[PDB]
Design a protein around this ligand. Structure first.
Ligand SMILES: CC(C)(COP(=O)(O)OP(=O)(O)OC[C@H]1O[C@@H](n2cnc3c(N)ncnc32)[C@H](O)[C@@H]1OP(=O)(O)O)[C@@H](O)C(=O)NCCC(=O)NCCS
Ligand SMILES: O=C1C[C@@H](c2ccc(O)cc2)Oc2cc(O)cc(O)c21
Ligand SMILES: O=C1C[C@@H](c2ccc(O)cc2)Oc2cc(O)cc(O)c21
Lengths: 389, 388
């Protein structure tokens, strides 16, 4: 009868908890050892032998062993506008991603739901995040139909976000789960590089870097507060989430949706900008918790490129073991934009079980998740591990 | 310190409350009575006389007296591909809205921030919503710079949502404010029709209807729980928020971002689907609260078109006064997509104050806000007014 009464009956008690993770990728695998030859072949750029030597360096130094890509040679050969550096092609790219992004996210969400063990109808919110394609109704609507979620699911469609949004979706799901008693949030990031694939331009080497780094993939997490201990198995606790813009980082990471598709700009200051600011972000997150030793917490960081992990490592004097879960996902999947950190969370807890650690976070109790992206924005999520019996 | 201690010392206690509302439009104004001549002239389509008759009737029946459009005749004369029905023009349209959408948002945000009267640094969250254009970094980042908000403001960027997103942003802001002690959420919906404006085609009358209804505008709202009694002024309380998809509505409203810009497609009698279904949403939102008389609550409904309001009003036998503020915004502003319900909320609390109503909701205590859009999606936000 009163709003205060509704607010007490509404709202949950405990902190947002990750209850399941699942991941999926296209079946087409592309090995980095073959990509320089493959890429310069299908883009009819073999005559640019000087540029091809540069690409061989980037692919050799990428610390990427393989990527999964929906795009095939057979398809590209039928789509020369997408193989040119810059040709009319947004319509052709949209036709792929508008169908394939929700399709890939469905593959990931099914695995998360399966491990969750609860009926799909219990899912109350859906947070769908992509950086490839836009459409009305959005990919959130398509996924809802594909999975058969209830029609009254509360959907949040995060479009054209960039690579920091892996942390964004957890910050979003945290407030949804925590403010709504019983809420169970399905979170899906799904990325498909058909929107960004393009040929090589000697005058835009930062775009060439994108071609050596970005890959396809989707990851799904189910987040909820007040877990049913009898039926749900917690993995991580979401303690706090923050976003920030880095000083003097204007223009560091740009991306425009145009008739030639999604373009990509990237300054060489990106590794320096992140490494030089990461400690301010760590202090902001962990000082109120009383934590100052960055080697005593587990680490999840978006692997924008190997140079970012190298310079964050050196700047903060991390032990090589702390970036292992991050470097493994980079090596085995490449840069999947917003889905990366969720993949790393999945790899963190799996290895923690296989190795016999005390917790899902490599035996450590507290952890941090970092997303980096256009802004330059940095998303920081404090995590807490769960004991492994 | 445990994670439990954090949660307790992290959350707010009270309900999310609307503390300030500001609106803004482009200055360039077009009266509907003049638009068929203007629209057919600038699109070089005066020779399709039968189509023009159809478009007059579209405009006559729209119940819109005027709309604001950033696009001017001088600009359009230099952009023939945007005046054609179907010509490559995404790049030009993007070039417009990527700059003008946050600019119009700051005009409304500055009004709301002035009414709120608190320092801009106190803003902790920003929810920016637009259906006109996309970009990385987004319009939320542009607005942060233009307003001098703190670099650490938590931004949510809602792109390509559609007309129902005026309710979506309140549903987002509700959980941000309520779950974070001290959080003050700036909510900005900004819409500019340069992405959908296109010439007429005789085989695409659904697109032509959009040319009759859609206008430009931006609206800003500041949301927080636990208001300061001396320094802040509650206008409305967000009680609950829900989203649903209507049965048998597949494909009723589709919109595709293509190389010719944002196209618009209708397929399944939108006024019938909303009114056939509105009572279910009312009962879902208000049966837990013991209300069943849909005339006992104030109404804010997204004015997608007059037919939606007519059939919904007739389905639940609404007194003509319940739809008044909604129809006034439709008449003086057109269909401004996500921003419409925020304009109506402002009109309602102002008109309730101009006249001597007891509450900000036209003298009533409880209220309902509806967003309608692609899905068919219905957003339902239960409101509670504030005594004047
Ligand atoms: C690209 C990268 C993998 C190359 O590995 P490396 O061992 O550092 O080798 P280099 O530093 O010499 O870079 C290789 C070449 O690409 C170029 N390169 C690296 N970053 C570049 C950038 N933003 N723009 C243009 N060229 C770049 C270098 O100039 C170099 O060309 P060169 O042989 O003529 O000197 C590494 O620099 C890296 O990880 N950069 C981070 C990229 C990034 O910001 N990712 C975030 C994506 S949002
Ligand atoms: O090249 C390396 C680095 C190595 C490593 C990681 C962390 C650490 O602390 C020490 C060594 O792990 C790996 C594990 C692999 O399966 C394959 C590899 O190629 C590598
Ligand atoms: O640091 C590396 C190197 C990486 C790698 C191997 C081969 C290759 O061709 C490219 C990258 O594999 C890894 C695999 C891991 O599980 C953990 C790691 O730390 C690493």
């Amino acid at each position: 009868v009163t709003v205060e009464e509704v607010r007490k009956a509404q709202r949950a008690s405990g902190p947002a908890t990750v209850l399941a993770i699942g991941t999926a990728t296209p079946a087409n695998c592309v090995h980095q050892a073959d990509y320089p030859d493959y890429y310069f072949r299908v883009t009819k750029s073999d005559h640019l032998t000087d540029l091809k030597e540069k690409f061989k360096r980037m692919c050799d130094k990428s610390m990427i062993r393989k990527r999964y890509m929906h795009l095939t040679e057979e398809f590209l050969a039928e789509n020369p506008n997408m193989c040119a550096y810059m040709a009319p092609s947004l319509d052709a790219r949209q036709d792929i991603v508008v169908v394939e992004v929700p399709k890939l996210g469905k593959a990931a969400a099914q695995k998360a739901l399966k491990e969750w063990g609860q009926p799909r109808s219990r899912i109350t919110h859906l947070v769908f995040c992509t950086t490839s394609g836009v459409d009305m109704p959005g990919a959130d609507y398509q996924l809802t139909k594909l999975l058969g979620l209830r029609p009254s699911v509360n959907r949040l469609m995060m479009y054209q976000q960039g690579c920091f949004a892996g942390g964004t979706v957890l910050r979003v799901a945290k407030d949804l789960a925590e403010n709504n008693r019983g809420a169970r949030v399905l979170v899906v990031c799904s990325e498909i590089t058909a929107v960004t694939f393009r040929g090589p331009s000697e005058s835009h080497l930062d775009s060439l870097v994108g071609q050596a780094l970005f890959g396809d993939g989707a990851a799904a997490v189910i987040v909820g507060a007040d877990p049913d201990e009898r039926a749900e198995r917690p993995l991580f606790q979401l303690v706090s989430a923050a976003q920030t813009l880095l000083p003097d980082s204007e223009g560091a990471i740009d991306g425009h949706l145009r008739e030639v598709g999604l373009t990509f700009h990237l300054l060489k200051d990106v590794p320096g900008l992140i490494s030089k600011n990461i400690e301010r972000a760590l202090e902001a997150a962990f000082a109120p918790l009383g934590i100052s030793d960055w080697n005593s917490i587990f680490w999840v960081a978006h692997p924008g490129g190997p140079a970012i992990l190298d310079q964050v490592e050196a700047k903060v004097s991390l032990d090589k073991a702390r970036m292992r879960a991050t470097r493994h996902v980079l090596a085995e999947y490449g840069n999947m934009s917003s889905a990366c950190v969720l993949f790393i969370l999945d790899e963190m807890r799996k290895r923690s079980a296989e190795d016999g650690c005390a917790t899902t976070g490599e035996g450590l109790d507290w952890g941090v998740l970092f997303g980096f992206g256009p802004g330059l924005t940095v998303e920081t999520v404090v995590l807490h591990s769960v004991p492994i019996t």
